[PDB]
Amino acid sequence: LRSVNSREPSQVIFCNRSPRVVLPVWLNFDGEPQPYPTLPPGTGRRIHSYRGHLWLFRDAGTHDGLLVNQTELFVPSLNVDGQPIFANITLPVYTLKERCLQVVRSLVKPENYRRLDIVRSLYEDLEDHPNVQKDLERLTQE
Amino acid sequence: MYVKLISSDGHEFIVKREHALTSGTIKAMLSNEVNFREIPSHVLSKVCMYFTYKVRYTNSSTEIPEFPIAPEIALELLMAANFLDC
Amino acid sequence: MDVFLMIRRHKTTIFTDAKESSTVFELKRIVEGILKRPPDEQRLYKDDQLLDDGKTLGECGFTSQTARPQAPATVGLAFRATFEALCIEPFSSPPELPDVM
Numbered sequence: 524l525r526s527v528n529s530r531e532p533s534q535v536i537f538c539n540r541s542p543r544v545v546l547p548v549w550l551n552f553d554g555e556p557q558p559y560p561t562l563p564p565g566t567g568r569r570i571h572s573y574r575g576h577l578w579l580f581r582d583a584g585t586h587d588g589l590l591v592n593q594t595e596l597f598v599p600s601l602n603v604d605g606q607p608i609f610a611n612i613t614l615p616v617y618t619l620k621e622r623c624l625q626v627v628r629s630l631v632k633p634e635n636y637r638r639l640d641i642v643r644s645l646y647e648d649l650e651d652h653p654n655v656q657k658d659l660e661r662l663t664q665e
Numbered sequence: 666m667y668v669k670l671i672s673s674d675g676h677e678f679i680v681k682r683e684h685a686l687t688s689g690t691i692k693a694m695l696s697n698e699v700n701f702r703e704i705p706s707h708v709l710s711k712v713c714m715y716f717t718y719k720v721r722y723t724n725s726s727t728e729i730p731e732f733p734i735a736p737e738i739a740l741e742l743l744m745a746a747n748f749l750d751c
Numbered sequence: 752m753d754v755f756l757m758i759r760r761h762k763t764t765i766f767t768d769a770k771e772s773s774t775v776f777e778l779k780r781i782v783e784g785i786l787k788r789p790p791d792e793q794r795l796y797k798d799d800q801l802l803d804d805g806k807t808l809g810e811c812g813f814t815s816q817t818a819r820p821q822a823p824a825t826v827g828l829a830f831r832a833t834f835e836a837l838c839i840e841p842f843s844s845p846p847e848l849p850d851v852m
Contacts (some may be wrong), residue, residue, distance in 0.1 A: 540728045542730075542731050567711050569699040593726065611726075612732065613728060613729055614729045614730070615729070616718070616719055616723050616729065617732065618751060619712070619715045619719075619732070619742070619744070619746040619751045620743065620747050620750075620751065622715075622732050622734065622745035622746075623734065623739060623742050623747075624743065626734045626736070626739045627739050627740070627743055630736055630739065630851045630852075631851050635850075637848075638739065638850075639849060641740060641743070641744060642744075642747075645743065645744070645747060646693050648747075667765075667785055672843070672844050675762050676762045676763075676764065676767065676840070677762055677763050677764065677766065677841075678764045679763065679765045679785060680766045681764070681766070681767075695796075698774075705842075705843040706843040706846050707842045707843045707844065708840035709842075710764070710842055711766075713766050714820070714821050714822070714823060715767060715821070716764070716766075716822040717768070717821065717823065718757060718820045719755075719821075721755075721819070721820045725778065726851070730819075732819065733822070734828070734852070735845075736848060737845035737846070737847070737848055738826055738845050740848040740849075741845065
């Protein structure tokens with residue numbers, strides 16, 4: 524699951540239609556994740572990339588998943604006669620559970636995290652921070 | 666068309682059946698009414714709103730908003746979201 | 752344009768949506784269908800202010816800025832016709848935050 528080696532420029536653009544500090548993540552030729560400078564909430568940014576390349580996007584501070592053009596995998600496609608491809612970054616409709624972890628994880632230091640009263644299976648879920656590497660494997664088995 | 670969900674504290678949230686079906690736990694609980702001996706009002710109202718939210722925003726370009734959760738409510742909600750699988 | 756409501760009286764709450772242009776009286780029909788009491792035996796409010804059958808939900812305050820799926824706006828229901836006073840039981844209090852900011 525890797526970016527194809529080019530070698531054909533592709534003018535892309537990341538609109539951040541989300542309310543988080545977005546983190547572009549590019550998928551190397553080997554398949555490793557490369558972080559690119561972050562995109563604040565309303566903002567956007569013109570990028571050069573390449574037909575065939577793989578990009579995904581996450582909340583830059585907590586790595587929560589985000590959609591681009593309604594999927595997770597953004598493939599800069601052919602530019603031709605038309606100029607930039609659009610990369611609309613959005614919240615998905617998170618499960619209410621996932622949504623709950625999110626606040627919760629962010630109101631308590633996981634340092635301090637043992638000391639809250641709830642089923643322990645719940646406590647593993649909170650510890651289970653979403654992760655590129657993870658989703659990278661997850662998004663691998665399809 | 667409609668169902669009723671009754672909180673641990675008495676309150677009745679009457680809601681559309683498909684909206685309620687969102688939660689598998691609930692689905693299984695009918696097939697009418699679900700009493701929820703374990704979920705207070707400040708918690709089931711937020712759930713129902715979440716169903717509305719999910720149902721409207723699922724399958725949609727129109728930029729999606731944050732579902733919001735006040736702090737005080739979060740634990741309780743996380744426990745409910747988890748019992749109900751939603 | 753969909754508006755998203757919480758129709759509340761006593762301990763009863765209906766979640767529904769409706770069009771920004773539908774009529775107040777049209778809301779009571781909706782209610783009718785559910786609590787089965789006809790429009791003339793129900794009176795509907797926004798914050799105490801007593802709403803008119805002929806007016807639109809938009810005209811009445813209910814606009815997509817105000818009545819969003821994830822934060823539905825509230826509509827007082829009151830019954831009978833002598834009409835009972837409007838009484839909405841508040842929701843349960845959350846317990847206080849554990850040791851977190």
